[PDB]
Amino acid sequence: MKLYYTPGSCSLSPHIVLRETGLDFSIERIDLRTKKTESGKDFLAINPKGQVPVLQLDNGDILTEGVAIVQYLADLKPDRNLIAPPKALERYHQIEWLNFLASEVHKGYSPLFSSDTPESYLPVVKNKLKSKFVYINDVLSKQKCVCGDHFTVADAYLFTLSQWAPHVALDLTDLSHLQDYLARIAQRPNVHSALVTEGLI
Template sequence: MHTLYASPLTCSLAPHALLLEHDVPHEVRYVRRGPGRLAVDEALARLDPRRKVPTLVLPDGEVLGEMVVVLGYLDERYGPERTPVERRALTRWLSFLATELHKQVLAPAFDADTPAEAVEDARARLLPHVLEVCADAVRQRQTLLGGPPSAADAYLWWALILLEHRWRADVPAELAAWRRAVGDRPGWRRALDEERGLLRS
């Protein structure tokens, strides 16, 4: 069985959705995050001193961390067969979303310790280009790679949920519609409903 260390509605929502979509036997252990967005959980700290979510423990005990690695593993292990070219395209999208959207825009936007000026700079200077690149891709191919939604689509889906919560007017209508459509997949919807419920309780 896989074990996913997660925190509700953080980026760990994306691997949670993929585990459910592919009917992978797993358990989710929700952890609280403290200063520096580090998990406050002794068990996770023993597994991985980086103390970040998502952390995925494989059935053989191997510990995976970082979004690109966790999502890449789930897609390779449980997603469709991909050619080497398609695999590189997936890695490119995962890396782009991780570096250009997640770390540069979303992380400061949801970090109370980030100065407001830095948040607004990322919103005005970086976000429009990233969203246009993503919108152009789904406009041409319906998903980032074409074909069924991939791990990269799950990553973008999560990011758009947060962006629409924080800056709804900044998200192009076509990306908002795409987010709703792709998020209607049963596993993705279950993951989102579960994590929203945890925040309400």
């Protein structure tokens, strides 16, 4: 399969996941300003929504939306346990966390990246985002990973989303349980490996 991505963006999540699954995949950069693939092709014809990540399956089908992507993957290599079996309870709490990250944290960043966002509304947005991380912090002071004890697709997404913190001037240094957790993920082989391949580290 082929994962379309942009270095440092949210596609980093499924990237980290692709490695942990130890699968066969090809990646291809996307230029978000021109909406063109590094090979010079029209990206809107691949994904009308014009964002990354996007995943091309071996049968030509396209899967958009990070949370959908990381789940399709993790659900192919159960043995690695990046998820929980479907219909199971643990899984439902995982989907719940993925939705929270996608809608409350991920989308909470959006305005800090827009040029048309009133510089005055910026401190307000930041505070909203911080509170979200303060909560995640709490969750961590009791368990290893956000969705339990073992590393899951939801930890990849949270890691990716916290990488943007610096670039937007969001100090999460105080969140000790989060930091130690972040530090513990930056060490994982395939995380460090996927990070290098992207031009960071």
